């Protein structure tokens, strides 16, 4: 009655506003017997979305 | 004049009467990423012609 815990209302987030993430289940088929590895972006260390 | 070496006329061959042979230049593509190895005869130790 004299002093109730006061709720924490204001909170900040500097990161991304998302709750879903895309994850890999089965790895890529590289290297393979048909498409030469020099084709895939991943072979050049290119960072993908 | 008195005794000349006599030629060796009669000779026998019990093997195959052929002078040409088929040879491998570049090995087979087995195993591979498409045809499962269980397809090729060579995977069952079958002797081929």
From Swiss-Prot, chains A, B:
Residues annotated as signal peptide: none
Taxonomic superkingdom: Viruses
Location in or out of the cell: Virion
Subunit text: Homodecamer; each decamer is made up of two conformers of VP2, called VP2A and VP2B. 12 homodecamers assemble to form an icosahedral capsid. Interacts with protein mu-NS; in viral inclusions.
Family note: Belongs to the orthoreovirus lambda-1 protein family.
Function: Inner capsid protein that self-assembles to form an icosahedral capsid with a T=2 symmetry, which consists of 120 copies of VP2, with channels at each of its five-fold vertices. This capsid constitutes the innermost concentric layer of the viral mature particle.
Name of this protein: Inner capsid protein lambda-1
Lineage: Viruses, Riboviria, Orthornavirae, Duplornaviricota, Resentoviricetes
Entire-sequence positions represented here: 247 to 295 of 1275
